[PDB]
Amino acid sequence: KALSAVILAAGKGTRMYSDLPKVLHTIAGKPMVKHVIDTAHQLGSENIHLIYGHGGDLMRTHLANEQVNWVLQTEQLGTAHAVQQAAPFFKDNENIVVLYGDAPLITKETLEKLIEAKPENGIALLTVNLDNPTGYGRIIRENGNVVAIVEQKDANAEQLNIKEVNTGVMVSDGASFKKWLARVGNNNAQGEYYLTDLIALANQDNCQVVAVQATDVMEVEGANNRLQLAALERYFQNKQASKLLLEGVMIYDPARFDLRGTLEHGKDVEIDVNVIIEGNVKLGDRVKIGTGCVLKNVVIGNDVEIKPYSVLEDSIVGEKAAIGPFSRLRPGAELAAETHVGNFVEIKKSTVGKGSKVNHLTYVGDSEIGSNCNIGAGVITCNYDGANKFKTIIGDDVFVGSDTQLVAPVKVANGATIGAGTTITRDVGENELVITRVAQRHIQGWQRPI
Amino acid sequence: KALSAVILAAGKGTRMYSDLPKVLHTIAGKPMVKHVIDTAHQLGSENIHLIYGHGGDLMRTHLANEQVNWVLQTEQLGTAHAVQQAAPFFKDNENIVVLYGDAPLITKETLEKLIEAKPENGIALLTVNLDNPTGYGRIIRENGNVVAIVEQKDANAEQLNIKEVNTGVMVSDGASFKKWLARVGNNNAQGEYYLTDLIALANQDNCQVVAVQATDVMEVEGANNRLQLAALERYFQNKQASKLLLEGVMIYDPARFDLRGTLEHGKDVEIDVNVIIEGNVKLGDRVKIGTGCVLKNVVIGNDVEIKPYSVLEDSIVGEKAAIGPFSRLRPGAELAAETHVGNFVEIKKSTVGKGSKVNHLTYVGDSEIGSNCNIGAGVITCNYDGANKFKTIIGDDVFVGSDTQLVAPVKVANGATIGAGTTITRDVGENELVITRVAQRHIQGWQRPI
Amino acid sequence: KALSAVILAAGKGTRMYSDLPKVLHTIAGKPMVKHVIDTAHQLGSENIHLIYGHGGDLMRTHLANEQVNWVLQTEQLGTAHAVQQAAPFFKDNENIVVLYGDAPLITKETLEKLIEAKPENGIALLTVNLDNPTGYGRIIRENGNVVAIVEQKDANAEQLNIKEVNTGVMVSDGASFKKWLARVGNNNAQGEYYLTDLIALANQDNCQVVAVQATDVMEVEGANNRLQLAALERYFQNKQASKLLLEGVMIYDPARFDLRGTLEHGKDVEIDVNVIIEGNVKLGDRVKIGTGCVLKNVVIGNDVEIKPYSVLEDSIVGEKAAIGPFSRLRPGAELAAETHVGNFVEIKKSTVGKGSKVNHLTYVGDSEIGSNCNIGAGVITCNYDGANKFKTIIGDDVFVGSDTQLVAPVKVANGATIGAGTTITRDVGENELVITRVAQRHIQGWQRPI
Ligand SMILES: O=C(Nc1ccc(NC(=O)c2ccccn2)cc1)c1ccc(O)c([N+](=O)[O-])c1
Ligand SMILES: O=C(Nc1ccc(NC(=O)c2ccccn2)cc1)c1ccc(O)c([N+](=O)[O-])c1
Ligand SMILES: O=C(Nc1ccc(NC(=O)c2ccccn2)cc1)c1ccc(O)c([N+](=O)[O-])c1
Ligand SMILES: [Mg+2]
Ligand SMILES: [Mg+2]
């Protein structure tokens, strides 16, 4: 049986006090609605009907590449009215799952269990037990089936003690949705067409409604403000960290670890406190990440150690390389195996060959450095004024003395030696030794003003 | 009706194992007693009577500027004796609130509710419910009024089950305080004059004592050691973070956020984990603060992004500026709109004009830099030996080549160009190009010792 | 009465998904088994019998220096079989305590209370109360003595409600262990010889088994995976931080503090959030450590302030020194009293004399710097190519101008002055002023390409 999803995402999110619409606020670096779209995709949804409204232009720019059907809602008249906007696109013989852009932690596993329980021509309603169910619609089960969702204000004393409550998440076939949505009324205090009413309509038609309990409450929780969003964030981070720990990643403190994307890892990986992993990150075996590192879109080979307070982005690090502390790898930094990058070093769009070292107070930009080079402290690759970021090409086995400026476009051939304090503007030949001729004034008996 | 406060702050705080007296230990960067003084001020207190004793000289140096009446207590004979020291200064027709220098989280809101409930010629006693009230004085209410505070050792089985306990915080008029304090005795195991006894004395005089429950237990908790102080700190930090989140500040992790002063913010502000905000900080709209930043006494314009591990102090940052990662702004750094400050860059008491860039391994101190300047990597402003920190004045549209030393006092005029590796000691004229003439020795066939 | 310990440490730890055996995973920087060995040593154990098996070679390399008896177990046939491997080495008249390499938080205090309760020719069994005891062996006490350890699958309804459970930790004399271990059978579902059976065997012999409740559950908890290991880590860190706070160390956030070794401290020490203390660290009075610092094997004198994001290792810091922010002290850095080390500064195997300053973008390696020296921004000590890390010797009261390279081996005598941008290769005499003679090309009317 086929499946399609409807995601409610039209909300303004007034209590976020933001220029963004509600569902664009992020959880682990990606919009709340994107988590829901990805879950619906993971489920095998043929179509994903996205109900949107407030901040329409921002929704379109931030989610331009999502394979969704854009259903523009002009008036907020309740959740049944929102779902009915997508109803002309429902296949009669497909299942439809209703999800909420502001409740991002719903899992594929929970939803699979919900779809599976759906009786033919009936509804599968996602429910949850609360220690304090006050304010939520109570689940009334008679003969194993859901006969009513009794709201707080209507419940009798005995019903107020029911801990099982309605989440809003439900599954039914497209024909049943089309049929029942056309029958929902707005005769209530809010004057809204509630999707909740489908339970009563299904019962009127002698169709069964089966309840399916969610594993965690946090899967059904919605974020109405940034405090609630921060609580979903911490729950999501704890869950990601716990999964990594059970896979064998040594995360020293799961409460001080953040994953905002995907992590591929080998065995015996050690991650110290306050590390942030962003985008797509791949770590080989025995990678050690020191305190305070930020890795965004990087590939790290086996046996690499990243020392504290290193920031890496869009970079590749070969096996047994040693980075940090206080190293900065900017996009395009490609470090070969057994390389060394030290404190207060910045590498940008440069390749560094096997065994080469760049250990102090250096800027290497738009360069190619060969194997077994020694880049002295204070070395800087630079350009002439008005240039267009030209390249510095350094061969194999080159020594570059401390505080040397390499003025691109320039080539330094294999085995060349450059003395400290040099300004390199002309190409250096193979085995060429280039040393600066200094002129100095020496004044004897110079008594300091102390 | 007028109000004045009495704050007990004479304690040694032996269990802090410190040379400081008890109340000078800080919560969110300010002494515990200062929080209480500020609360009493926010309430509208005409006078704030500060009872002090231990570490008297340190109290005077650390709180020199507080608008308090210094009441030096020579002997610790109990809380009623402490309050009686200030009693000759109470106005008969004013209300007096008794507060504790070591219980800093008491709120203005709680105290307003306490003052309001105070019956004429009576007492308003602040109380709190505890799940485990063991050791605390139980509130005995008869005919809605507080008839007794029954201590742990005296309570009957039924009274030990009372969860409502005495906090020590109370309000009464100045004449009633003067009258009842003169009647407090010390006939008890400790031989102390307890302020607690005022409840029994008020009852003897047929004056009503009304109980007022505190909203949070943490408002009445006192810190006797640094473990307790750390628990008040975390509660205070969580409360500050929660308020900011409800105002619309996106704090990624409220458990990894510290505010030690005041924060003024615009909309869509994003604060990553492990950020510290000190003194008075103002952030405009859409300010993004990366992980590990420290902002102390700074003004940050709209649309500024501060990248990870940046430390800013007594600085101003114009709109759309980009700072970090690993940037250091020291006092007097003034960055104009659309400026760029990069990694391993230190700016001290310098103004940097619109669109100017200082992106790598640079020290700029006591300087004025104009608009659209390019400050190369490794550039350093310096002085002669025995100098008195002279100024470097750089005009508009100046290019300063990498690893150039600018020797103050020096002026570089508009549109000047400075080549890499230069030593600037003489003023550079408008559109003047200054390039270093290098002498180099080139030795061919130099085989490295590898 | 003498004591010896047996520690079970043969486990593979399959669920760690690691190449290391189970007990080598660390808690606070040291292997789980090492914590247990140290506890057994603190107790006064004459012998420590270490049962090992999986990852035998790694156990031997990682614990080479431990004063233990290496008992190589070839087959895992249950805990009684493991303890019996060490039994030929038990003295009849000594007490034997059985401990587990994967339950590292067991305290000396708990074990002292266990040994003390041991009745002659009997057993002292360590027990613990659990709110949910499901799955654990229930303690059956009859006439004050332990008559049985009833397993989950055998317990009657009434016995399942017993909250007191078996921990596996026990004490008995060597003769009793030898005797009872020879009588343990493997007739059970697992076909293993359980140490648990010693309780039933002691009862058969009319020897009393006394229960001793552990203070904390976490002392008896074992780590089977890295999630469980992380929970023991956080509990251990919280306990260490709480002890330090009660001793008077101001730890701003005990949940963001890590101690991985030993800390000796004076009074009025302040430690900001996210600090890591490794190896042996000693702090004097009024030491202030800013956010994000890492101190490994360092001695810090009184009144030192370490500013944020400083990494120190195998270094000594004299009184009133000022370090950071962003300073790096590498092994052998020895800073005398009243010295100053600033941002983006790296000190390696160098001594820096009293009052000397190294405040910006500098590398000082293999050097001796005297008193009251001024090391300018951008200064670098370096070597010739093929050198063997030679020394830079700087006297007292030397000024070294910004962006100067000091080419070791070189000596700079007392009161010498070095101008900015200099290359020092030759020794500088007492009171010698060395300034660079620059040649520059000046081109007027150079219009920039803007
Ligand atoms: O109803 C919406 N979202 C929604 C619905 C239900 C819940 N459920 C709960 O929070 C919940 C339920 C039961 C127990 C605990 N929490 C959480 C969020 C909704 C409606 C229209 C919208 O447009 C949007 N949106 O995302 O903008 C959300
Ligand atoms: O009594 C003092 N402080 C004080 C008094 C009461 C409390 N209250 C509680 O801790 C409390 C009460 C009820 C329930 C929970 N906590 C906390 C602190 C006091 C007295 C003399 C002093 O000199 C100082 N001081 O600040 O140095 C404090
Ligand atoms: O049994 C072993 N360890 C062990 C034994 C008991 C416990 N106890 C508990 O976890 C416990 C007990 C009671 C209540 C709560 N937790 C924890 C760990 C064991 C046996 C053989 C081994 O070789 C190793 N090891 O360390 O590799 C451990
Ligand atoms: Mg330099
Ligand atoms: Mg230079």
Side-chain angles (χ1 to χ4, degrees):
Chain A
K1 184 113 161 166
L3 178 72
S4 288
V6 182
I7 303 170
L8 278 73
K12 190 178 191 70
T14 293
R15 301 285 131 129
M16 296 289 184
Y17 300 104
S18 177
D19 283 349
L20 287 181
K22 195 177 195 189
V23 304
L24 291 186
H25 301 281
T26 67
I27 290 294
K30 74 180 200 201
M32 286 201 285
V33 70
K34 175 64 169 160
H35 282 266
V36 188
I37 294 170
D38 292 339
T39 295
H41 184 70
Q42 296 157 200
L43 270 178
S45 302
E46 230 168 271
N47 293 302
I48 300 179
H49 303 283
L50 183 67
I51 324 299
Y52 81 120
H54 290 92
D57 306 336
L58 293 162
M59 288 288 285
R60 296 271 304 161
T61 73
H62 289 57
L63 311 158
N65 207 46
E66 300 313 313
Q67 304 182 190
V68 300
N69 175 220
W70 294 86
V71 185
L72 195 274
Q73 167 174 86
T74 55
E75 341 142 75
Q76 299 179 117
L77 289 163
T79 55
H81 172 84
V83 178
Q84 200 180 28
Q85 296 282 92
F89 311 108
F90 297 168
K91 294 300 286 92
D92 287 342
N93 214 10
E94 82 178 333
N95 275 328
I96 300 296
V97 61
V98 185
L99 306 168
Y100 303 90
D102 66 343
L105 308 186
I106 193 59
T107 72
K108 169 212 193 167
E109 292 72 30
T110 292
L111 294 174
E112 276 177 340
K113 187 183 163 196
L114 181 71
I115 290 151
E116 172 59 60
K118 196 224 68 174
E120 191 182 11
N121 293 313
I123 303 179
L125 181 65
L126 188 68
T127 69
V128 72
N129 289 132
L130 300 185
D131 294 301
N132 181 16
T134 299
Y136 294 94
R138 310 303 205 284
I139 305 309
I140 314 305
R141 292 164 181 236
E142 287 175 2
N143 306 316
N145 307 133
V146 182
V147 291
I149 298 169
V150 179
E151 296 305 329
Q152 180 69 30
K153 60 175 185 196
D154 299 320
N156 60 41
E158 178 199 292
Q159 292 170 334
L160 292 162
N161 291 330
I162 297 165
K163 303 298 169 185
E164 195 190 8
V165 304
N166 171 44
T167 69
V169 178
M170 64 178 75
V171 180
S172 202
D173 64 275
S176 298
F177 265 116
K178 289 183 226 181
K179 190 231 283 154
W180 294 322
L181 292 159
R183 289 163 47 189
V184 179
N186 67 334
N187 191 8
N188 49 63
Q190 299 79 40
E192 287 186 358
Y193 301 88
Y194 288 89
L195 187 73
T196 316
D197 288 3
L198 255 68
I199 283 68
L201 291 165
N203 277 290
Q204 287 175 22
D205 269 9
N206 308 131
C207 292
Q208 57 168 330
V209 182
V210 162
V212 180
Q213 313 249 212
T215 25
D216 207 297
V217 176
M218 298 298 283
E219 278 190 80
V220 305
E221 287 288 350
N224 291 331
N225 61 51
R226 298 179 192 271
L227 178 68
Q228 291 181 0
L229 184 92
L232 296 184
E233 178 73 29
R234 233 20 55 175
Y235 170 88
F236 188 73
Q237 293 300 340
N238 291 339
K239 266 230 296 158
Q240 287 190 126
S242 298
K243 183 179 190 170
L244 285 164
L245 284 154
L246 294 174
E247 286 179 359
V249 181
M250 186 196 172
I251 300 159
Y252 295 29
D253 189 4
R256 289 188 281 165
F257 170 82
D258 294 80
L259 171 64
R260 309 174 180 168
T262 69
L263 176 65
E264 183 176 335
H265 64 82
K267 65 185 153 165
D268 292 301
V269 172
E270 290 175 36
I271 302 182
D272 211 333
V273 309
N274 297 310
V275 163
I276 306 174
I277 304 302
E278 299 176 315
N280 307 123
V281 171
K282 170 172 188 184
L283 307 182
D285 304 322
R286 299 166 301 276
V287 169
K288 301 187 197 183
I289 306 163
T291 201
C293 296
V294 183
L295 312 208
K296 172 168 181 173
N297 293 311
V298 301
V299 177
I300 308 292
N302 297 342
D303 295 293
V304 166
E305 179 176 19
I306 309 174
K307 281 177 178 194
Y309 304 114
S310 298
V311 178
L312 293 73
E313 186 175 357
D314 287 341
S315 297
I316 298 155
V317 184
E319 66 181 44
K320 301 181 187 75
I323 310 311
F326 311 108
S327 300
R328 168 96 180 281
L329 302 190
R330 281 175 70 201
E334 297 179 17
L335 316 179
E338 301 173 18
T339 48
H340 316 254
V341 177
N343 54 202
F344 325 121
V345 176
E346 177 193 359
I347 316 274
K348 179 218 152 202
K349 208 179 179 180
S350 300
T351 65
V352 184
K354 184 180 174 172
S356 284
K357 63 187 201 182
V358 194
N359 285 343
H360 347 246
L361 294 149
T362 288
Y363 171 58
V364 174
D366 305 299
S367 307
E368 302 175 7
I369 297 173
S371 63
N372 302 296
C373 293
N374 184 338
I375 310 305
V379 168
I380 290 150
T381 56
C382 61
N383 277 275
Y384 295 95
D385 177 24
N388 202 49
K389 303 164 168 249
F390 295 117
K391 300 188 177 192
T392 302
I393 310 296
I394 293 164
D396 298 337
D397 302 287
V398 174
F399 175 95
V400 183
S402 294
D403 210 45
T404 288
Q405 311 103 39
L406 300 159
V407 194
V410 71
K411 300 185 185 162
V412 184
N414 291 351
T417 315
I418 297 162
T422 296
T423 306
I424 298 282
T425 49
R426 295 183 73 178
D427 288 353
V428 177
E430 185 166 359
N431 300 326
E432 187 185 4
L433 161 67
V434 182
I435 50 167
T436 293
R437 287 279 291 149
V438 292
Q440 295 170 346
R441 182 173 284 267
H442 298 252
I443 303 155
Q444 303 311 319
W446 181 258
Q447 194 68 57
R448 292 191 56 231
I450 61 140
Chain B
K1 184 113 161 166
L3 178 72
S4 288
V6 182
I7 303 170
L8 278 73
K12 190 178 191 70
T14 293
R15 301 285 131 129
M16 296 289 184
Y17 300 104
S18 177
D19 283 349
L20 287 181
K22 195 177 195 189
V23 304
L24 291 186
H25 301 281
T26 67
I27 290 294
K30 74 180 200 201
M32 286 201 285
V33 70
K34 175 64 169 160
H35 282 266
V36 188
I37 294 170
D38 292 339
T39 295
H41 184 70
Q42 296 157 200
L43 270 178
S45 302
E46 230 168 271
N47 293 302
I48 300 179
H49 303 283
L50 183 67
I51 324 299
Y52 81 120
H54 290 92
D57 306 336
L58 293 162
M59 288 288 285
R60 296 271 304 161
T61 73
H62 289 57
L63 312 158
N65 207 46
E66 300 313 313
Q67 304 182 190
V68 300
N69 175 220
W70 294 86
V71 185
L72 195 274
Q73 167 174 86
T74 55
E75 341 142 75
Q76 299 179 117
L77 289 163
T79 55
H81 172 84
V83 178
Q84 200 180 28
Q85 296 282 92
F89 311 108
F90 297 168
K91 294 300 286 92
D92 287 342
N93 214 10
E94 82 178 333
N95 275 328
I96 300 296
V97 61
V98 185
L99 306 168
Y100 303 90
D102 66 343
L105 308 186
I106 193 59
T107 72
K108 169 212 193 167
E109 292 72 30
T110 292
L111 294 174
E112 276 177 340
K113 187 183 163 196
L114 181 71
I115 290 151
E116 172 59 60
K118 196 224 68 174
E120 191 182 11
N121 293 313
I123 303 179
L125 181 65
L126 188 68
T127 69
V128 72
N129 289 132
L130 300 185
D131 294 301
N132 181 16
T134 299
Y136 294 94
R138 310 303 205 284
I139 305 309
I140 314 305
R141 292 164 181 236
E142 287 175 2
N143 306 316
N145 307 133
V146 182
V147 291
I149 298 169
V150 179
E151 296 305 329
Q152 180 69 30
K153 60 175 185 196
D154 299 320
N156 60 41
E158 178 199 292
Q159 292 170 334
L160 292 162
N161 291 330
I162 297 165
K163 303 298 169 185
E164 195 190 8
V165 304
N166 171 44
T167 69
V169 178
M170 64 178 75
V171 180
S172 202
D173 64 275
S176 298
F177 265 116
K178 289 183 226 181
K179 190 231 283 154
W180 294 322
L181 292 159
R183 289 163 47 189
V184 179
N186 67 334
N187 191 8
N188 49 63
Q190 299 79 40
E192 287 186 358
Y193 301 88
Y194 288 89
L195 187 73
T196 316
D197 288 3
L198 255 68
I199 283 68
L201 291 165
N203 277 290
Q204 287 175 22
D205 269 9
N206 308 131
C207 292
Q208 57 168 330
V209 182
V210 162
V212 180
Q213 313 249 212
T215 25
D216 207 297
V217 176
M218 298 298 283
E219 278 190 80
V220 305
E221 287 288 350
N224 291 331
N225 61 51
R226 298 179 192 271
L227 178 68
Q228 291 181 0
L229 184 92
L232 296 184
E233 178 73 29
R234 233 20 55 175
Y235 170 88
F236 188 73
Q237 293 300 340
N238 291 339
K239 266 230 296 158
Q240 287 190 126
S242 298
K243 183 179 190 170
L244 285 164
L245 284 154
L246 294 174
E247 286 179 359
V249 181
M250 186 196 172
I251 300 159
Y252 295 29
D253 189 4
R256 289 188 281 165
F257 170 82
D258 294 80
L259 171 64
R260 309 174 180 168
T262 69
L263 176 65
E264 183 176 335
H265 64 82
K267 65 184 153 165
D268 292 301
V269 172
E270 290 175 36
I271 302 182
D272 211 333
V273 309
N274 297 310
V275 163
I276 306 174
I277 304 302
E278 299 176 315
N280 307 123
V281 171
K282 170 172 188 184
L283 307 182
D285 304 322
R286 299 166 301 276
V287 169
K288 301 187 197 183
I289 306 163
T291 201
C293 296
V294 183
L295 312 208
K296 172 168 181 173
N297 293 311
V298 301
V299 177
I300 308 292
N302 297 342
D303 295 293
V304 166
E305 179 176 19
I306 309 174
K307 281 177 178 194
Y309 304 114
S310 298
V311 178
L312 293 73
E313 186 175 357
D314 287 341
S315 297
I316 298 155
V317 184
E319 66 181 44
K320 301 181 187 75
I323 310 311
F326 311 108
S327 300
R328 168 96 180 281
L329 302 190
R330 281 175 70 201
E334 297 179 17
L335 316 179
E338 301 173 18
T339 48
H340 316 254
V341 177
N343 54 202
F344 325 121
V345 176
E346 177 193 359
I347 316 274
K348 179 218 152 202
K349 208 179 179 180
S350 300
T351 65
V352 184
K354 184 180 174 172
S356 284
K357 63 187 201 182
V358 194
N359 285 343
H360 347 246
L361 294 149
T362 288
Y363 171 58
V364 174
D366 305 299
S367 307
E368 302 175 7
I369 297 173
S371 63
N372 302 296
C373 293
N374 184 338
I375 310 305
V379 168
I380 290 150
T381 56
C382 61
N383 277 275
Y384 295 95
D385 177 24
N388 202 49
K389 303 164 168 249
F390 295 117
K391 300 188 177 192
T392 302
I393 310 296
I394 293 164
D396 298 337
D397 302 287
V398 174
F399 175 95
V400 183
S402 294
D403 210 45
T404 288
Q405 311 103 39
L406 300 159
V407 194
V410 71
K411 300 185 185 162
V412 184
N414 291 351
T417 315
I418 297 162
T422 296
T423 306
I424 298 282
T425 49
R426 295 183 73 178
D427 288 353
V428 177
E430 185 166 359
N431 300 326
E432 187 185 4
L433 161 67
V434 182
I435 50 167
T436 293
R437 287 279 291 149
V438 292
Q440 295 170 346
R441 182 173 284 267
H442 298 252
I443 303 155
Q444 303 311 319
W446 181 258
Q447 194 68 57
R448 292 191 56 231
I450 61 140
Chain C
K1 184 113 161 166
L3 178 72
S4 288
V6 182
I7 303 170
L8 278 73
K12 190 178 191 70
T14 293
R15 301 285 131 129
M16 296 289 184
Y17 300 104
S18 177
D19 283 349
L20 287 181
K22 195 177 195 189
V23 304
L24 291 186
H25 301 281
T26 67
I27 290 294
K30 74 180 200 201
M32 286 201 285
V33 70
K34 175 64 169 160
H35 282 266
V36 188
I37 294 170
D38 292 339
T39 295
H41 184 70
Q42 296 157 200
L43 270 178
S45 302
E46 230 168 271
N47 293 302
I48 300 179
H49 303 283
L50 183 67
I51 324 299
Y52 81 120
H54 290 92
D57 306 336
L58 293 162
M59 288 288 285
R60 296 271 304 161
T61 73
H62 289 57
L63 312 158
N65 207 46
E66 300 313 313
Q67 304 182 190
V68 300
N69 175 220
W70 294 86
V71 185
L72 195 274
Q73 167 174 86
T74 55
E75 341 142 75
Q76 299 179 117
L77 289 163
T79 55
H81 172 84
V83 178
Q84 200 180 28
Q85 296 282 92
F89 311 108
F90 297 168
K91 294 300 286 92
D92 287 342
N93 214 10
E94 82 178 333
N95 275 328
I96 300 296
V97 61
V98 185
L99 306 168
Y100 303 90
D102 66 343
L105 308 186
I106 193 59
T107 72
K108 169 212 193 167
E109 292 72 30
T110 292
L111 294 174
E112 276 177 340
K113 187 183 163 196
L114 181 71
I115 290 151
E116 172 59 60
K118 196 224 68 174
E120 191 182 11
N121 293 313
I123 303 179
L125 181 65
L126 188 68
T127 69
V128 72
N129 289 132
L130 300 185
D131 294 301
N132 181 16
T134 299
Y136 294 94
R138 310 303 205 284
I139 305 309
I140 314 305
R141 292 164 181 236
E142 287 175 2
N143 306 316
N145 307 133
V146 182
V147 291
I149 298 169
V150 179
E151 296 305 329
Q152 180 69 30
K153 60 175 185 196
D154 299 320
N156 60 41
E158 178 199 292
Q159 292 170 334
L160 292 162
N161 291 330
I162 297 165
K163 303 298 169 185
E164 195 190 8
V165 304
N166 171 44
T167 69
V169 178
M170 64 178 75
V171 180
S172 202
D173 64 275
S176 298
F177 265 116
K178 289 183 226 181
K179 190 231 283 154
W180 294 322
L181 292 159
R183 289 163 47 189
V184 179
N186 67 334
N187 191 8
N188 49 63
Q190 299 79 40
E192 287 186 358
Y193 301 88
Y194 288 89
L195 187 73
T196 316
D197 288 3
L198 255 68
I199 283 68
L201 291 165
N203 277 290
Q204 287 175 22
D205 269 9
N206 308 131
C207 292
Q208 57 168 330
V209 182
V210 162
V212 180
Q213 313 249 212
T215 25
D216 207 297
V217 176
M218 298 298 283
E219 278 190 80
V220 305
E221 287 288 350
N224 291 331
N225 61 51
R226 298 179 192 271
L227 178 68
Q228 291 181 0
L229 184 92
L232 296 184
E233 178 73 29
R234 233 20 55 175
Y235 170 88
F236 188 73
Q237 293 300 340
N238 291 339
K239 266 230 296 158
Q240 287 190 126
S242 298
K243 183 179 190 170
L244 285 164
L245 284 154
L246 294 174
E247 286 179 359
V249 181
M250 186 196 172
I251 300 159
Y252 295 29
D253 189 4
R256 289 188 281 165
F257 170 82
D258 294 80
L259 171 64
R260 309 174 180 168
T262 69
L263 176 65
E264 183 176 335
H265 64 82
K267 65 185 153 165
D268 292 301
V269 172
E270 290 175 36
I271 302 182
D272 211 333
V273 309
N274 297 310
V275 163
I276 306 174
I277 304 302
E278 299 176 315
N280 307 123
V281 171
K282 170 172 188 184
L283 307 182
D285 304 322
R286 299 166 301 276
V287 169
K288 301 187 197 183
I289 306 163
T291 201
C293 296
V294 183
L295 312 208
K296 172 168 181 173
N297 293 311
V298 301
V299 177
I300 308 292
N302 297 342
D303 295 293
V304 166
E305 179 176 19
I306 309 174
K307 281 177 178 194
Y309 304 114
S310 298
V311 178
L312 293 73
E313 186 175 357
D314 287 341
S315 297
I316 298 155
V317 184
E319 66 181 44
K320 301 181 187 75
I323 310 311
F326 311 108
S327 300
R328 168 96 180 281
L329 302 190
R330 281 175 70 201
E334 297 179 17
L335 316 179
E338 301 173 18
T339 48
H340 316 254
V341 177
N343 54 202
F344 325 121
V345 176
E346 177 193 359
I347 316 274
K348 179 218 152 202
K349 208 179 179 180
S350 300
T351 65
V352 184
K354 184 180 174 172
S356 284
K357 63 187 201 182
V358 194
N359 285 343
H360 347 246
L361 294 149
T362 288
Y363 171 58
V364 174
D366 305 299
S367 307
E368 302 175 7
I369 297 173
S371 63
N372 302 296
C373 293
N374 184 338
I375 310 305
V379 168
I380 290 150
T381 56
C382 61
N383 277 275
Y384 295 95
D385 177 24
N388 202 49
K389 303 164 168 249
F390 295 117
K391 300 188 177 192
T392 302
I393 310 296
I394 293 164
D396 298 337
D397 302 287
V398 174
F399 175 95
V400 183
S402 294
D403 210 45
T404 288
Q405 311 103 39
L406 300 159
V407 194
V410 71
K411 300 185 185 162
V412 184
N414 291 351
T417 315
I418 297 162
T422 296
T423 306
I424 298 282
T425 49
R426 295 183 73 178
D427 288 353
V428 177
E430 185 166 359
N431 300 326
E432 187 185 4
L433 161 67
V434 182
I435 50 167
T436 293
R437 287 279 291 149
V438 292
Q440 295 170 346
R441 182 173 284 267
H442 298 252
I443 303 155
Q444 303 311 319
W446 181 258
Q447 194 68 57
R448 292 191 56 231
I450 61 140

